[PDB]
């Protein structure tokens, strides 16, 4: 009676990342309360506990900068401090019984260079994922979010890169986990088929030749330019994106997850987001879940905030989360 996974992005390890793939590591603001000893960074783990206990959520996405994980050492070993801090957020998510999406928030780029297309080589990128897969191989509820919002890349070359990553993840022993396949056009669900991403990514397989647990990863916003930067919503995305996608998915016996979606905490979005979510829930054979953007280190002033408010051991949700994303039933 609905998609399997409902949850939210717990952002902050990605603050300082821009759409060119530059992540300034000094600017991260991770949602771990005691990240520095001040004990007053945003309380991502406390948020997740509320989301799971009160709002029936079962998945969280944890955006993080590539540069952060390797401390700016392209192709290097994961930095022991960085991975130690990030893993605290990962384990907090997993401890709640949720699935946890590790999301490399890099737009298929490193400091302006496109992975495998002038920027880092495929090997420098698979090296990142091989290490993460090795770390998380024994934890089946870690979900490998290969890349956030590739855009303006050669989709044929990108699909090959994605294939190399999937191979690396499986060969490292992470054989049980879900793996995301992200396409072009900022992962837009609306362009996923028409821009050729669906076809190219459909060719990616596990070592055994199957496509088992390889899930198409799309994004879609509800404002006029599909940017998620305006408060008001202007579409429920059904005719333009999710109906054609459902049909395609179903005919091909494949599945997709919507890892970013959101809107203002206003009436237009309460209406449109609920229509969108309802359609996903009525097509839960092909849609595995939805993940709202965004909570974690975002606060009450962020236009798409989904961060709950703590008041005397009580949390209160934003209106869009409470009215549309939450599952209190
Ligand atoms: Mg609680
Ligand atoms: Mg677009």
Curated annotation (Swiss-Prot):
Organism superkingdom: Eukaryota
Residue numbers annotated as active site: 149 (proton donor/acceptor), 260 (nucleophile)
Disulfide topology: 17-23, 93-100, 233-269, 274-324
Sites where a glycan is attached: 34
Catalysed reaction, written as an equation: Endohydrolysis of (1->4)-beta-D-glucosidic linkages in cellulose, lichenin and cereal beta-D-glucans
EC numbers on record: 3.2.1.4
A biological-process GO annotation: cellulose catabolic process
Coiled coil: none
Region spans: Catalytic: 2-328
Annotated function: Endoglucanase (EG) that cleaves the internal beta-1,4-glucosidic bonds in cellulose. The degradation of cellulose involves an interplay between different cellulolytic enzymes. Hydrolysis starts with EGs, which cut internal glycosidic linkages to reduce the polymerization degree of the substrate and creates new chain ends for exocellobiohydrolases (CBHs). The CBH release the disaccharide cellobiose from the non-reducing end of the cellulose polymer chain. Finally, beta-1,4-glucosidases hydrolyze the cellobiose and other short cello-oligosaccharides into glucose units.
Domain notes: The enzyme consists of two functional domains, a catalytic core joined to a carbohydrate-binding domain (CBM) by a serine-, threonine-, and proline-rich, highly glycosylated linker sequence.
Family from the record: Belongs to the glycosyl hydrolase 5 (cellulase A) family.
Name recorded for this polypeptide: Endoglucanase EG-II
